[PDB]
Amino acid sequence: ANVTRKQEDARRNPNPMSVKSVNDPSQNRLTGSLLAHKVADEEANIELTWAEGTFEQFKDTIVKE
Amino acid sequence: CKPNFPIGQISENFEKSKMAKKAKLEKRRHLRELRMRARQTAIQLKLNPDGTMAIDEETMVVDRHKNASIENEYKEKVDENPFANLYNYGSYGRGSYTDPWTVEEMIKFYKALSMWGTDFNLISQLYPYRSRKQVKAKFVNEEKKRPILIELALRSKLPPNFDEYCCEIKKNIGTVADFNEKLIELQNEHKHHMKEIEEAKNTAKEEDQTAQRLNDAN
DSSP states (O other): OHHHHHHHHHHHSOOOOOOOEEOOTTOOOOOTHHHHHHSSSSSOOOOOOOOOOOSHHHHHHHHOO | OOSSOOOOSOOTTOHHHHHHHHHHHHHHHHHHHHHHHHHOOOOOEEOOSSSTTEEOTTTTEEOSSHHHHHHHHTSOOOOOOTTTTOOOSSSSOSOOOOOOOOHHHHHHHHHHHHHSSSOTTHHHHHSTTOOHHHHHHHHHHHHHHSHHHHTTTTTOOSOOSTTHHHHHHHTTTTTOSOHHHHHHHHHHHHHHHHHHHHHHHHHHHHHHHHHHHHHHHO
16 A cells, blocks of 8 residues: 555656676675565465365375385 | 715704705706797676566676686695795896807807897897897807907908898798888878877867857757
8 A cells, every 4th residue: 555655756756877896895795684585575476276185195195105 | 074965963854855955956947948849797687577677686796706716726736845935145136047059040140240230139039039138248258259250240341151142031031011111001090090080089079069058048
């Protein structure tokens, strides 16, 4: 509900270019726990077909010793 | 019991001294064979199903050390013996060992000194990997060594025994081009490119004043 509320706020009064950089040994880069949120936002969903089985796996254990 | 080298008592920790000496003799002999042989990374993107046409944030920056570390891994490893680094007055001073001259070189030395008076500029390249400094000293030491064989050369003021006709053209057959006019023609090309960038200079200048004059009106 609020991601639309911020998007309309920009377009009411919109008020206004990338070249490489160098890794420096006197500078830190974001890593650790917030990097896990940087890779948990954009990745491939899988649409599950929810089913109800429970006998195919059951006898699969019975036949195996 | 002569004062040079008796092996005669305990002599603690001489082994590190021993193989250092046998390695410095090995080092200088590999310097001999360099002489004998010489005589003769944009930016990358990808196409996600979620966000297509997205560019990689890690490829935006460069590490500047992974490329250096590849070759540094592929260098030879050696264990430094603190005896090996020894230094004397003959250290860190320019000058090297001159390869001593042969008599096969003297016929190209006497005749090049027979044709001209004494001209060290063009005779340097005749001996391709000899330099201007030590060949000047070869003129100097022969004054004391062979003073009379040099004294025949300046008396000779005539074209010599006509065998230099090959060595007249053996010098000439390297990069056969009319050098009296080869330098002229490409120099005229160079000032043509400078005149064209000078045309590009002022034509960039006149449109710039034209454009911002319109901004001064508005």
